[model samples]
Target: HMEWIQSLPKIELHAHLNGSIRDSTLLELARVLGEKGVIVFADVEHVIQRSLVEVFKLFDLIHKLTTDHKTVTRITREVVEDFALENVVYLELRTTPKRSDSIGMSKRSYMEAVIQGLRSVSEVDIDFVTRKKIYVRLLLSIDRRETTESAMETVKLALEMRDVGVVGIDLSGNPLVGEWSTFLPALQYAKDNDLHITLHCGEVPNPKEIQAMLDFKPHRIGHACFFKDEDWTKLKSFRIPVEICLTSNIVTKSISSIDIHHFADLYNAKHPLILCTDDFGVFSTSLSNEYALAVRSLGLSKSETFALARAAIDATFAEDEVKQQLRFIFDSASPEH
Candidate 1:
């Protein structure tokens, strides 16, 4: 069952760029910085072995390591490579671009650095017939801690880079910090521009705000772990697909255990859903492992798992043409379909 799940072609939609840095990659980056006197070599190994309780601290360390444009590019490339190795055929990596005065990297430059990484990977040749050819797209993130102006700037950047593979805008950050009204104008502008919107909603149960987020009609939502019964009905009525990150929630203590996860509730409700690795490195989960967990914990049959895999195609930010292409692969590969 594990091997079958691991080999299944998957799509990843909620992975964060810096949060997906592999432990080895982080160690190497730290060493490189230490060699350049940017950081101390003595601290490199310590971070690699850090626990999940230190996730926010981990993010701080990652930010320190990835301050320069070159490092950002390197990490982006490695993040894409890591997912590709997990049989992920399509991915949308989200990141909040930051400006660094010391490095002279502007927000635009930050985005360009990430794009450089994406293009670098895409240009490399892979045997599409034998191995899955990974296709990646970017989602510019509006950190909840940012000001309204900053959020608008991210949306503007996404619009400007749409031709270069920027597909959407994501509202994500420390969920407890920001208000919806603070970002409404920027979100409205994104909607006006026809840019895809994926909100990090209901990470905790706040019925009023969750309803507001739902009313915004996001293209999709992530981490809907705290929905009430009515909220679940609301989600169903809207038919908005939810992105579930099993390991992330577990390690973060959002849900106590996999057995009682909202994943089972949503699955039973026949809610349109996609399994994602919210932060692969942080949670030590791959998209395949997520599927395996769902199967084991949620009691999914083999056929149900296959159907669940296909269900994500429609929920992807990808176009109809891309959806058809993926469907072809799944249809052809399934002998009994």
Candidate 2:
């Protein structure tokens, strides 16, 4: 059924912006920056040297090379294009906004550059003009390391950019680094402004924070591998959709294999869930690949996979009009052309 899954329209909600850089693009950018003296080739080589066991190190090096706005636009265009290749009809790309006054790249400026990249895509149709075209949305992330003011600042900026497809806020980055209270004021602000919020939850064994995230009742949560038994009951009670990344979870060792993954439980519980590639290029995976893994690992039937993909539309932060358009796309499709 991989062929069927591959051709089926999909929804992607948890992809990280910097985390999704194409391997070819990452390499070429490293070369460009290395020759320009913006970065050292030796440092970039160390990334290739590790074979991506340390992909976050590669993520840091990407922060080094993609420090400017132009690169942001370049990467965004390709990220969307890559999703389009997988026949992903809807995508919510998330990233922590960065600032660099020395480069005339304030957070807003960087976001503007991202907007430009979204605009630069002309080759393939987007916004679901046809069944193959992908409709893209942006979700700004508030990394846990940020101070409360900076976190709130990101929320305000997202509010400001909602017109340009900025749909939601993602609270992510090194779940082990910062406390929930550190980000709650900003999370609360997002709710007050009617902006959707998704928190990175249970990536580690932080049960207290996981419970607090559930209690906060975000629009969604990502990576709930470490939830205790009671936590699942409460999570199901809240009925918050979870963005499950089976491949990313494996690479990151959130759970050893799909055999032992909690997705089985969630699926049985009738929980609202969406399979997403947390980072496409990082894991060399796509939404299709993820759906394939679910079917392969857990024996999801073809129609089951299709329905799961369809139901995720209800979980997206995209507007009702866009959601309706996407609904038409799915409802009108089949396993065969």
Candidate 3:
């Protein structure tokens, strides 16, 4: 059953770069630091144990582990490799471009490093096991804790770097920290510049914020774990694609269990759902494993899963040509085709 699930072609739309490092990679980085008396780690078990915390605590350690561009590029390449290993044919990796004044890494330099890693994977011949090509896109994120100026700078950076793999702007980070109106100007700027927008919405019950975000009309929204009845009606009316990260919701304590996750409710309502791996490394889940969970918990058949996989193409920020290419892959791979 897992083998069949693993073979299903996948698309990852909501993954965070810093949160996607492999466990082995995390230990190796820690050990490298440990040798220099920077970090004290007994083994990989230490890293896994630390990552099992709530969302914010997890990111604090992630930032500690990934301090410079070298580590950033290493994690970026490895994250892509890991997803490709799971038969992910297309990926849109998102990250808040960060700078370390001590290390002299600017936001632009940070983004360039990420693009370097993406280019490295795309230039490779074929994946070792799957022997299939993987297409990767980059989405620059504005952390919610940032000042409005900082968020605007992120949008400016995304617009400037749009020529080199940057396709969209995302509003993420700690949902409890920032006000929706604070970031509205920056999000509006991105839309004015034709850059796509995806916001982390409704992770908590902030009705006014949710209403404001819906009014902003992002190209897509992520999490959406908490919703009032009117919120559900609004989402359905908007027909905005929702990026559902199942394991992340459970691990982050956003929901009590997978069986009661909004995924089933959304699917039953015929709402457009794009199942994503929000943070594969942090949540210890893969794109294939996500579909597998859906099968077991949501009772989706092979064809239904394939249909959901195919449906994500319409939600991508890539050019029409890229979407068409992905569409052909899904079409040709389908048994009915």
Candidate 4:
């Protein structure tokens, strides 16, 4: 069962730092905050199975503990170790900046903390292939609830951290909120500034709203889960990659079954895309788990799997030269069949 789990090359493009948060760690934070009477569950597992209301409440709890730089730094380091078991070579973590009025941590300071967390991981070897150091990039995300100004603030933060790990800006959160026009300005701003853009389009149940998002031209998207009937042509035309998360989608009932997933349609159309675990820890999955899912569910061949990986690496925001370097690494290392 765990054999394929160990030896897979993976790239994570859509996992949220907050959503990807380890629940046990959250429980530990709750205890540290002394948050009693929130919801007494038998343990962390129970909290994850909470209803939508309970999950939103948990976000409030996340807001409370995520303000401090030390806390943010610590969680960042922890995410690395938590996801390390998947033998991931690279990953992109997305998060909204945490602000603390009491501690006086500016949004930028909070973002710095998130960066420091990955840097903290970089300080120590985490056992990558050849014992090489892993790489991580930041995707500053703005939710639909934010106004254009708020969205721009995220971009401002991106500009400041461009030299650091921050590589792109993303529009996340519920895709059902409204039309894509609401978020296009932010996407435009990132484009004008030469920053990379990825979106969470097609996550809405409507499935046809994907066309509206396609107009803005994102570099890639988290889940085109609800891809429109004929949108595959446009997606193929533009070369936009969709970050598919099978378990997260099916488990949430976004899709009734993974077997009937539309990924095969996209692949047939040659929709240059890749696979990812949207919230691996929460779904009890990893990058390799996602690969195996694609293999079994989408019936991807070994060559096709490698194509997905290479396509993801090529479309990544990693600098051109750095991308070539990573490609070399991927090419040189073959799965022991």
- Top candidate, metric TM-score: 2
lDDT score of model 2? 0.86
Q: Give one clash count per candidate, in the order shown.
A: 0, 0, 0, 0
- Model 3: worst 10 consecutive residues (lDDT sum): 122-131
Question: lDDT of model 4 at residue 49?
Answer: 44
Candidate 2 lDDT by residue in tens digits, 4-37: 7778898899999887888888888888888998
lDDT of 1 by residue, 65-173 (tens): 7788888888888888878877777788899899888789889999999878776665333321114477677889999999999899989998998877788899998
Order the numbered candidates by TM-score, best leading: 2, 3, 1, 4
The TM-score values for the models, in the order shown, are: 0.93, 0.95, 0.93, 0.88
Candidate 1 has an lDDT of 0.83
Show model 1 residue runs off by greater than 4 Å. Answer: 35-44, 122-131
Model 2 worst lDDT run, 10 consecutive residues: 123-132
lDDT of 2 at 1: 69
lDDT measured at residue 260 in model 3 versus the true structure, 0 to 100: 87
The best candidate in terms of lDDT: 2
lDDT of 4 by residue, 45-139 (tens): 35654444555556656766676788898888887765655666677778888556779987798887876777677543542211444567788
Error of 1 at 265 (Å): 1.3
